[PDB]
Structures are given as C-alpha cells and as structure tokens.
C-alpha cells in the first residue's frame, strides 16, 4: 500500500479539502500536518486511504457540530493534541499493540491466594442458533454471572445498538484463559457484559481500563471481594485506569496512597455507565 | 492407470508443451526428464494424468509469473531441485510414506510421566447438522480447546477457505489416538485448530511439522509446558520442524546444544501464522 | 380538541422555544404568529399538538442547516411567506378540502369518449397477497399502463422508500371514477406511477397538479398526443399546474397565449423527477 | 465528488503508478492524459475514484497479459484510441446518453406496411413467484416469441450466468412501447432474449446495436423478412451496428450498396452469439 509520506500528501491535497467541502466548513477549519499523521497512525490501519478519508470526514462533521455550538470568523486550526476531541479515543497503538482497543475482549481483575491476577475475557459472536458456550474452567457462579450479563443485553438491544435478533441467529462463546487454571466468583459480571456487548456490536472495547464488579439482571453493579489485591495487580501490570463499583468506595483506604495516586478510578452503579466508558461508539467490523 | 515411464512420455510429448503454449511461455521454459518424474511422484496420486496436466499448468503459469518480474535470454530449464519453487511443498512422498501431508491430521506433542509422546489429532468433516464429537479419552480442558479452536475458525470462514455454512451443514469428529490412554491439557489448541481447518477446507496439513501451543478464542498462541520432554519426542520421532509459541522462546536454551541446532523452530504468536505454515494452499478433495 | 388560539399560545410559550433550544439555535431564529398560524392550518390535522411539535422541530433543524450554509449576526425572523422554504409544500388546506395532497390519488389527463379529459386516479393499498384490481371501465392500453407503472415501482422500492415485500403482502386496486364512463390510452401512465407510489408509501400526492405522459418500464416519460385538448381540459377544470413530457415542448405553441400563461408547466424525462415533484417527503398515514 | 481535472491529477500521481507497480509493469507501460480522461468519462460514473482505481488496475493487468503474449522494447504509451482494447466496450457515453448500455433493454428492428421502425424491448425482473407479464399490445406470435426466448434461458442458466432458481423466485415483465400501437411477429425473438437475459443476469445490454431474428427453443436464430426496410430504420434511428440471421445473407445481396453502406452487420447462427456480442461481461446492479 501507500507509505505514511504518501498518505499525508494524499490527505493534504485531496481528502481533507474534499471532506471539508462536503461538510460545508471550507474556509473555517484546517488540520496541521502533525494532526493528519496522528489520524493515520492511531485511527487507521490500512493499505489504501479509504479509512483516513472516513476519519477526515468525521473531523469535518464534528467541526460543523462545533460551528452549531458557536461560530467564528477566519480559520480554526486542529492540531495533533486537539485530535481526540474530534475523533474520540485512539483506536490503534503501534507503540504498544497490547494496550489498544479490541472487539470481543475486556480486561478483568482476579483475586487469588498468591496475590492479584489479570483476567482476559474473550467473546466470539458467530452465525448460529442462539447457543451459549462458557469455557476456561469456569465455576457455576461465574457461568451464572455470564448468563445474567447476557440476559441484560438481550433486554436492552436498542440501548446499545445490538441486533434485534441476535438471541436466535448467533452463537456466543465466552472464553477465559488460561485454559488450565480454574476460575470462579461473581466479580467479572460487568467485565463480561463489556465483552459480550463488544462482540455483538462489533465495537472495540478499551484495554487500558481494567474493571471488576458483580452485575445483576436489571444492570446494577454490586460490590466485590479482594479490592486491595486486585488494584495492585492492575498497577504492577501497568494499568492505571480502573472501573469499580460505587459501594466499594470505602475499601480504597486499604491501598498504599502512592499506588492509589497512580490509578484513575471511575466509580459505577449502572452497567450502562460502564459500557459508555468502555465501548467506542463506532463499529470496526461487519455485523454478522 | 499408466506406468511411470508412460507418464513421462505424455508429459513430454503432449501435456507439458500444451500447458506451456496455453500459458504463453513457449520457447522460454523447459522441464527436465527428472523434473517431470518428480512432478509425477511427489505431486500426483492417480491412475490417469489429469493431476499431472493440472500440476504442469501451474509450473508454466509460475514461469509466466517469473517472466512478469523479469525477462531473460533464451529458455531457462527447470530441474527437479527447482520444482518446489514452482509448485510449493511436496504434496506426496511415496518412498517415505508416513509423514506426507494429510487432510484432517496434525502432529501434536505430549508430556507423559515416563517421557514425551507423539500426539496425532484426527478430524472428520462429514455431512451433518452441526454436532461435535470429541473422542479418545479427552479431559474437559482439552475438549474446551477444541471448542475454542472451532469457534475461532467459525469466525474466520472467509480467511482460511472454509464453507460459510459448515456450522450447521457439517458434523465434526475430533479423535486423538490411542483410544485407551487418557489425554488432557490445553497444549494442543493450535494442533487441534490446524487439523479442524484442514478437514473443513480439504487442504492437506503437513505431518513433517510437530506443533504445541494453547490457543485463545480470538487467536493468540499462548505458552505451555513439558517443552523439553515434548521436544525430544519429536526428535526421537524424527520430526525436525517444530512450531512453538513466541512466549516460549525463553525455554529453548535449556536442552542440549546439538538437539537444539538439529531442529528448525518457528516461533508463533498467532494461530493464523500456524495455519499458513501448516496448510498447503490448494485443496486436494471435494467438500 | 384545541382552539387555534389555544394552539398558537402553546407553540409560542412552549413548543417553539423547546424545539429551537434543543436544535442548538436559541437566539438565532424566530417565527411570527402568522408563521405559527400557517403551520397549524396548512401543516397539521389533529386535536392535539404533537404534529405541530414535529413541524416546529423541522423548522429549527432546517434553521441549523442555514447556519451551516452561512451564519448571521443577531436574529432571523421566519414569517408566513417563508414557511414552505423550511417545511416544503403545504400538506393541508382547510378552506377547500378537494384539491389538497391526498394518499393514493392523483390528477391525470387521458382519453374518455369526449376525449382529452381530466381524470382522478384512485389507488388503495390494503392487506393482501399481491393481487391487482383495475376497475373504472379501463381499456387494455390503460390497464397495461398501470402494470408498467406498478412494475417500475416493484424494481425501485429502495429509491422511493416503499415496503420491500409489498408485492405479496399487499393487494392493489386502481379505480378511475366516474364508474360508467370508459377510459383508455397510455397518457395517464405517470399518474398511475404517482398514485400507486403514494398509496404504498403513505406519502400524499399533490392534487393541484395534473400530469400526462406515457410511462415506460425503465421509467422514461414518453410523449403523448392531444397535448392541446388535454391542457384545454385542465384549463377548463381550473387546474393551473401541468406536468408534461419533455418531448412535447413543441406542442405548447398550439395553445392560445392567455391559456398558456395560466399554466405553470414542468417538462419531465424520467418518472423519478415526476415522483419527487408530486410526493410530499413525509408519510401522513400508518404503514401497511 | 471530485471534479474531472482533479480526478485526473490523483490518477496520474498516485493511482496509475500504484496499479502499474502492483501489476509488475513499472517502466513498461504508460497512459496519456487524454486516455485517463476517457477512463473517467466513459468507464466510470462516480463521486470518488473507486471505479477509476478498479479500471486502471484492469489496464495494468491487461498489459500484463500482453507482455507475456510478447515483450516490447521501451515504454508503450496507451492513447485514448487504445483504451477499449484494454477495458472493452465503453460502459457509458455521457455525450450521447441514450445510446449507452442498459440493464433489461434491447433494440429491435420492426418493419411495417409504411416503412421500418426501431422497437425497444423493456424487461424488468423483480422479486416474485414465477409470473410473466407481456404488455404493449403484443399479438400472440410475439407473446410466444417471448416464451421461447425465456424457456431457452431457463435451460441455459449456467451458460449465461443466471440465478439457478429464477423461474420460481422472480416475476418477469416484458414491455414494448409504444403502449398503444399493436405489435406482432416472430422477428423480435433474439431481441427479447437479450433483454430478458440482461434483466436476469444484471449484465447491461448494448443500446448502440439493433437486431432482428426469430428464435427457437434449442437456440437457432432463424431467418426473417423485411430486411431492406428494417435496415433503413436503423439508419433513420442512427444505429450503425446490426445483428442479423446467418440465413438472411442472401437477402443482403439484393440490397443496393447505399443501404449496407454505414453498417456493421454481424451474422449469427446461435442465439448465444448474440448474447456474447450484446451483453457486457461484468454486471452493474445487484441481483
């Protein structure tokens, strides 16, 4: 495909000019050369430029939304630091491939007698007849929290942009490595709703955020165990953003300050608050 | 069917020159008497010679594809040693019958209390309703890997030449001999995945490569253990090409130096890499 | 229900200010009491005010479109003359209920025994199994013109937003009053298209325009004979808007000038432009 | 959408060099600015350049066919005159919009007591249950002509790239304007097959060709009458490419030179020869 040098010249001469024209914002907005390169690096992975154009279309349209809030005379420049305001959270990370957003996955936290451990929840949505598969040596409580998470999503298809008929035209497989290691507890409920919704919606869930919390059928995020040991593993693993239930606000004193400084904790009650914070708004794959 | 000497003759007189004129490369390529024998032996299994005409067509078009990259003086002759460049990996192996590529099998490796073993996975894609059978005394974890491997392939029907309706028009049967010996663990996920795909796509999986590795749902190849015992089993079996997880690289420099230099170790971190290295491109059977 | 004085008040102190505010346009646009009165009379048919709230929403959102085209300093007052610029052609007229837009009906110019006659093509789409009645004493040419019109619409459900499985869940009935009088000719083909499309889409077709033109299967509006007699009949009937095939432009010279200057004539080539000009964008009845 | 000189510059500086480099023909072939404009105007109808990128790839690839067929010495520049050699028949004619290819239509030559006229057979294939409508005051011989054409195409679904189950999932409507004029005769048989095949296949039929010929179930294009007056009709209309039955070669001997002057006259035996010549290779609309 095109080199990065090539894509930038293409965007400057043609794609941006075109997308500003169609948005109706020509003369009012421009993008810096660094901003275009940031759009290529972090919001596209590609051979051609048919995705870069999409993002430049988004920038121009969000600019028209800003024009609605308040207009201005002359030009308004969008720099690389200003980009996340227009396109949202960076979809891709070349520098750190593991950190980037991903469909049908979610970061979870695990208690265990050795200390803290990270739990990756994988979910595959595939053509089928409404069957569910639960693997990774999951105990009955962990399977039941899955089912509850799934049923919430089945009762809220319109709210999260899920198919109106995934219940009987899709088979779901929730897998939790490592395959040999047994797993149990209600604590990965929201982590699993995040991953099931992600798979069904084709919208990639963020992996720089690690979460824990028990989900209920109507979507209440309830308290969980071992908050000290879970948050430590998050910090030792380089995760400095955490989702955590509201009613576990009191447990935070058990941390050693210095680590609690590093963490960025968002306290939650509804599972809707979580999915909002975890899921990117734009799907990156076809529906199925 | 014809004899081999007779199969060289229709190759030389008619089939080859036909396939070269049809590919627009006549006068600029030739194949040797030995090279044709090798196409007959290692690339065709038949009474007739349609597979031979099929394979000679590929030799000619690849000559056309090399003609694309650069022209040359006169005609370039293709000797028997060149054939794998033009036709890929040997599809058959008569002189050495036991490790030729096969549809629906793959070479896994096992840790057994008294030293390592060889683990052959067998898969049978038959007309059916979508049922899965997992036999050979398999522990729950090992059965979960077959399910994890199957789901990966169900989500990538386009990417590996799989049918788009095999989930409900095909019964699968994973079997792992020998029948009595119980087997367990997640260290055959890619082994399973490979055999399962090969069976559905009808593309032969190579049996001169021994692999081991836990597969995740979305396709990460994850670390495993037994590593040293396993790797002798391959060695003491005679297998020299070994697929292994990327994160397992730190266990290589354990076992003796001549044993390590004797093997060809491909490190993988994605099951797509494994399926590429293992499966031959063209399918040798009907769905 | 509500008196129009009551409605004007509700609009002035609640509906208008809520719709402008939620469109991000508060302080930039206003509507006169005359403008609001016109919306009630010519764009609503209800005892409540929910349609009125729908319409005022469209004015404010169309105001936001003008803001994107080009901003203005201060205030912009939408008067009664400007309403169709924002809302399009009037949906109703209480003063004379006969000549307002209607679902599944249209004005055509075609043959009866007197020859060159203004006809009304009635169409009803009801629940069914793909059956088509062609009543009103129609000759075969006219029956066949309806079939060509219907087939076109079956091949362009996406283009005009029709139910995509209507061909076997809906029965159609094309009726042309008055019942006793014979009708024939290809000249009402585009009227058929209009009235059928209107009935299937629930989008009311304008009845202040009479049209004439042979429709083709791919959608070409082909010329028609008797252009003089037809346009005289529309002139006699008190109909002052005409749709005519483009190839019949030469025939206009047959008319006297005093009659020709009473007729707003629109020349057409494709039936696609006929439907755009006749059908109000929004549907005014429940689907089928 | 991009303007024309813009589409040109982006084709020159990026797309063409890309497609030549990908086809492996870098340095070997070029295209003129006039020829690039012809690809835009005649072979694409679009806002962006996805159509243009597709076609410049076809030019590069059709160049790859030719270099294998035989090499040249230097850079072979492709002029606008040559573009149809690389891309086939123009899919659009913006300057002359009515003569361009269309799905479901075909030009017929009909004779009458007064003279000759051009028929246009319109055929729409829509979702249905196997019904057939025949409108335009068609007489019985002309209705049966459509039934013959349709039945032939039902028997040759594989041959002309038609849906296998179109007979019971699709309704057909054959329409022939003018709506009022009565019409009859077997002469429009091949003309109908063109239109029906075109409608079912979604392959555009050429509208710069007018034809005439009786069709038979097995597919023989049979001879006809009124060969003179039908050829004057094509002249009257501005059609200068004619399809005629092989058996009417003797009828063209009587014709004065001035009637045959200005006409390309393909003579056909099988109805499959007509569909070859009339229908474009690639379909435009979805099924």
Automatic annotation (TrEMBL), chains A, C:
Mg(2+) binds at residues 109, 187, 212. GO terms for cellular component: cytoplasm. ADP 2 binds at residues 2, 18, 50. ADP 5 binds at residue 2. It is found in: Cytoplasm. ADP 15 binds at residues 2, 50. ADP 8 binds at residue 2. ADP 7 binds at residues 2, 50, 53. The active site is at 187, 230. Residues 100-281 form the Lon proteolytic domain. ADP 12 binds at residues 2, 50, 53. Belongs to the peptidase S16 family. This is Lon protease.
Automatic annotation (TrEMBL), chains B, D:
ADP 4 binds at residues 2, 18, 50, 53. Induction: By heat shock. ADP 15 binds at residues 2, 50. ADP 10 binds at residue 50. ADP 6 binds at residues 2, 18, 50. It is found in: Cytoplasm. ATP-dependent serine protease that mediates the selective degradation of mutant and abnormal proteins as well as certain short-lived regulatory proteins. Required for cellular homeostasis and for survival from DNA damage and developmental changes induced by stress. Degrades polypeptides processively to yield small peptide fragments that are 5 to 10 amino acids long. Binds to DNA in a double-stranded, site-specific manner. This is Lon protease. It comes from Meiothermus taiwanensis.
